[PDB]
């Protein structure tokens, strides 16, 4: 039952503020130094701040100074991160972690030991975005010399700026299945998604065969059909 549980995260708009909590249980919270660490999806760990057992000593990364404050309330087994003036660069999962133990030994001598981040919470998601329901803009990815190699040419549909997931894509109403690769969406810093769907086809068929991507976005109740052909 040693446990750290973060809360207070969620969706906020740029410029707004948020107060994270980390509740500690199963150990004597007031004996330990504590950190906040964050991680944007698909990116590395980024340390945010640390605070001594008693609250008197703090350090934090330069990029959050003037905006974020680490504090704690030992009477309530709680660590806080006040985050003001949030930007898109602050979108991340936020973890708290336990580090330095402070104790008195059996003879009454003060001792302490850094353990690194030895106990972690499960994280709380912070999303700094004004995104809301939006259907995609669909643009052709035309086959060309550069998307071609020998008898095989790739063509596709660029599906831009939608929210939320998911989008589904078929080609020629699902008649064309072979060589269809619909790529996972990118989550942009704005909070909107984009994806591409590509099909590989015979180079010799480019003049003859019509290719149409069918883009379905149920959340916005939008459907787009777009013929994709070589560019003059």
């Amino acid at each position: 039952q040693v446990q750290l549980v973060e809360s207070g995260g969620g969706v906020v708009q740029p410029g707004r503020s948020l107060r994270l909590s980390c509740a500690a249980s199963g150990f004597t919270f007031s004996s330990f130094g504590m950190h906040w660490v964050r991680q944007a999806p698909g990116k590395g760990l980024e340390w945010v701040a640390v605070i001594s057992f008693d609250g008197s000593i703090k350090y934090s990364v330069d990029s959050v100074k003037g905006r974020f404050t680490i504090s704690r309330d030992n009477s309530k087994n709680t660590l806080f991160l006040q985050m003001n003036s949030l930007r898109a660069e602050d979108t991340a999962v936020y973890y708290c972690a336990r580090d330095r133990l402070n104790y008195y030994d059996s003879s009454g001598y003060y001792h302490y030991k850094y353990y690194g981040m030895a106990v972690w919470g499960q994280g709380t998601t912070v999303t700094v975005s004004s995104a809301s329901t939006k259907g995609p803009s669909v643009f052709p990815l035309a086959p060309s010399s550069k998307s071609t190699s020998g008898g095989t040419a790739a063509l596709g549909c660029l599906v831009k700026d939608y929210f939320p997931e998911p989008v589904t894509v078929s080609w020629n109403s699902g008649a064309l299945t072979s060589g269809v690769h619909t790529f996972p969406a990118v989550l942009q810093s704005s909070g909107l998604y984009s994806l591409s769907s590509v099909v590989t086809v015979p180079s010799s068929s480019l003049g003859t065969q019509t290719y149409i991507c069918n883009v379905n976005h149920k959340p916005s109740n939008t459907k787009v059909d777009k013929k994709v052909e070589p560019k003059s």
């Binding site: 950190h35 760990l45 972690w120 790529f183 984009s194």
Partner: protein, 214 residues
């Protein structure tokens, strides 16, 4: 631009051993204790090693740490598929007065032969240019292990602004795919002669190029 340097990925077969190096300077690794963390997919990091080479309880002796000067190494022997994870080194930096992490290393336990990525690079469509926007789309598929590094260039110079790249994920054929997008204005698109997507995978690099004049 992580203060500590790790390789973006390493791999070996089940039963084999691997090392992951982490490199820094005298202000961090040189004079401070290193810890290592394991991060399984979707989970919080777990402490593997602290004080350069100690294991917390519940960490098997397959994991080890060592240190030499301004570098440290995590060793993993007897590789199991359950060891597939992202691995991070961390330490205090005395110059910054901050905790600093390496950029992470993806550890793949090889379950199939290594495969090279196919890269395709599409320029902005004239239709998109009519919407006053311009997206270059770099598509990367059929690779294994599931780690690539993508770099974009404009007339040979590095460009970092306006790049968005996905995390690789599995296709139905069990290889990986990813994509990278470069967002430009129509003006900056038309003003250079060449844009490039450079994909690095397991030592090999493929670079594709497009130009407004095409």
């Amino acid at each position: 631009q992580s203060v500590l340097t790790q390789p973006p990925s390493v791999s070996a077969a089940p039963g084999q051993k691997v090392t992951i190096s982490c490199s820094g300077s005298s202000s961090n690794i040189g004079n401070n204790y290193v810890s290592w963390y394991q991060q399984l997919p979707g989970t919080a990091p777990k402490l593997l090693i602290y004080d350069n080479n100690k294991r917390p309880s519940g960490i098997p002796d397959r994991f080890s740490g060592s240190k030499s000067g301004t570098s440290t190494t995590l060793g993993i022997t007897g590789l199991q598929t359950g060891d597939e994870a992202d691995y991070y080194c961390g330490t205090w930096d005395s110059r910054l007065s901050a905790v600093v992490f390496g950029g992470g290393t993806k550890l793949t336990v090889l379950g199939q032969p290594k495969a090279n990525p196919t890269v395709t690079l599409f320029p902005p469509s004239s239709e998109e240019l009519q919407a006053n926007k311009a997206t270059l789309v770099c598509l990367i598929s059929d690779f294994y292990p599931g780690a690539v590094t993508v770099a974009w260039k404009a007339d040979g110079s590095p460009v970092k602004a306006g790049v968005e790249t996905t995390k690789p994920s599995k296709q139905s054929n069990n290889k990986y795919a990813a994509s990278s997008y470069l967002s430009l204005t129509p003006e900056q698109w038309k003003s250079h002669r060449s844009y490039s997507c450079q994909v690095t995978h397991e030592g090999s690099t493929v670079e594709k190029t497009v130009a407004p004049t095409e």
